[PDB]
Amino acid sequence: MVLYFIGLGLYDERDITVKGLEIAKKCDYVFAEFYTSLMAGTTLGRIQKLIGKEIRVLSREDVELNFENIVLPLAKENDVAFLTPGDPLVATTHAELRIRAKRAGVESYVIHAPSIYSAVGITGLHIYKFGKSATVAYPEGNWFPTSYYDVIKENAERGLHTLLFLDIKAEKRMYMTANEAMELLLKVEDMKKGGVMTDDTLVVVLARAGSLNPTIRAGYVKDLIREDFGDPPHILIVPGKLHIVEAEYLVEIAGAPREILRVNV
Amino acid sequence: MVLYFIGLGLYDERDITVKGLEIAKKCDYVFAEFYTSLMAGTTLGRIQKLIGKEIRVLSREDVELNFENIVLPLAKENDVAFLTPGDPLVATTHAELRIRAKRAGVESYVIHAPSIYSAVGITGLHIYKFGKSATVAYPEGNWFPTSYYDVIKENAERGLHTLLFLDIKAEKRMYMTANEAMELLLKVEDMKKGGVMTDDTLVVVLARAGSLNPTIRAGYVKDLIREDFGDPPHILIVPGKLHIVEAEYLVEIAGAPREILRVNV
Numbered sequence A, B: 001m002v003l004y005f006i007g008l009g010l011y012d013e014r015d016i017t018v019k020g021l022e023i024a025k026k027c028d029y030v031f032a033e034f035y036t037s038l039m040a041g042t043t044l045g046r047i048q049k050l051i052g053k054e055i056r057v058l059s060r061e062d063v064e065l066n067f068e069n070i071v072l073p074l075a076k077e078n079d080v081a082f083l084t085p086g087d088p089l090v091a092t093t094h095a096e097l098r099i100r101a102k103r104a105g106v107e108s109y110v111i112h113a114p115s116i117y118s119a120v121g122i123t124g125l126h127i128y129k130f131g132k133s134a135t136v137a138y139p140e141g142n143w144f145p146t147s148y149y150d151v152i153k154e155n156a157e158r159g160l161h162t163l164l165f166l167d168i169k170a171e172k173r174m175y176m177t178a179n180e181a182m183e184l185l186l187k188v189e190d191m192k193k194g195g196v197m198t199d200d201t202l203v204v205v206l207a208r209a210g211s212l213n214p215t216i217r218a219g220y221v222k223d224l225i226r227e228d229f230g231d232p233p234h235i236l237i238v239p240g241k242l243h244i245v246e247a248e249y250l251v252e253i254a255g256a257p258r259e260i261l262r263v264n265v
């Protein structure tokens, strides 16, 4: 009579925690969703092969609207798992599902997994220096999202880094690139003109974290906006005031321009 | 010729990822450090057993001062593993170790694992609403550090949550409790009178994240300050103004008082 929210990690099926694999292996029913993020280094088959169970993949609608009609019911008489990319409660609304579980008299547990939210540490940027986070959403019709631009502004004013989750349309198989995010940022700059994002702004790109060779790059927008960072997923980071050691790492590991080593205190 | 930075996860020996365990098992030498943090739900013995390798522990001085003399030499002719609690490179100084590897002509790769930075998602608080993070340090002698107080003030002022790491004397295996942290904050409030921390301030406590049975509690300092949250480690969070969905979660899952649905939303 239990429901397990188990994270699968960043890139491939091996990013799952041992705890997660052992518990999933013994669950009667295994559900999962692959719309909140993209695990570029694996397939549904490989995950099934690793867990030894058939996995019923759910759509956003199946979850957001019928989680308690598709998953919870079985959880009352069985050990059920619900898998998700990265960590199941980071930058998703899956947390609210634990409430649905409670109201259906189902016990739920959470098994964490490596998340892009902490994996940003590989960029060399002090993780405690990150401020509010935001998402760069794809413009739709006449609707053009811009809130993420103000978030960057507020963080930068306080010298804090800004982590930018990039949009994803799983059904359309669309994964926003750091390039598309930079384009959208420049366009919003022309509108708000707050001097938040310009050709000379320093940015950091992390692509395919979790893989053995993620792409880690830092540089000025003017130089990175057209660079090829490889297959998605990508996140874009707008650093605040750098610490000298953050700069050295960006230069030594992310190929950033040597000149950023000279910080203006 | 290869150095692997492998994260051990949140609480016990099963919190390492499958990728990290397999790679660790294939390494000729395996180092670890338990000065940045400890794995409160396991032992060096249990981890050694799981990896099936002898694990040489390294002190803070071993890493910070002689990493290139103890670890890198061996990595030039073998596959070496360097294990750390949580997610690698989250501990402020570890990133520059990758620069040392580069200069020693050694290749390095990062194998991620869950970190408390993403694990706090289990509190039900939206991850994007967290602002700058801080650590609560014990006063001693004539030194009374209080920057963590200003961090809270600046985040809350912008409706952002503040993740507070509590002091730890790893070597002496001593932890600071959420209780002690709350007492310190009131003491600081009294000194700085900035109206940031009072008996009526809402806070969240997360203990033993990673365990299947963590302690998640939310309430006003006046009611939680002397509450027993159990064995360490403890994580204290000072939430900013809450979104209704966050409050409902704290109420239904963390046992927070209904009062928050009207007072803190």
Ligand SMILES: Nc1ncnc2c1ncn2[C@@H]1O[C@H](CSCC[C@H](N)C(=O)O)[C@@H](O)[C@H]1O
Pocket (backbone or CB within 6 Å): A010, A011, A036, A037, A038, A085, A086, A087, A088, A089, A090, A091, A092, A114, A115, A116, A117, A164, A165, A166, A167, A168, A206, A207, A208, A209, A210, A233, A234, A235, B118
């Ligand atoms: N391996 C990876 N590399 C780079 N960005 C990633 C990533 N995994 C997720 N993301 C980023 O996060 C977005 C999904 S947001 C959901 C995040 C997920 N629960 C987690 O814990 O990571 C993606 O569109 C992308 O911008």
Ligand code: NA
Pocket (backbone or CB within 6 Å): A127, A128, A130, A131, B130, B131, B132, B133
């Ligand atoms: Na943060």
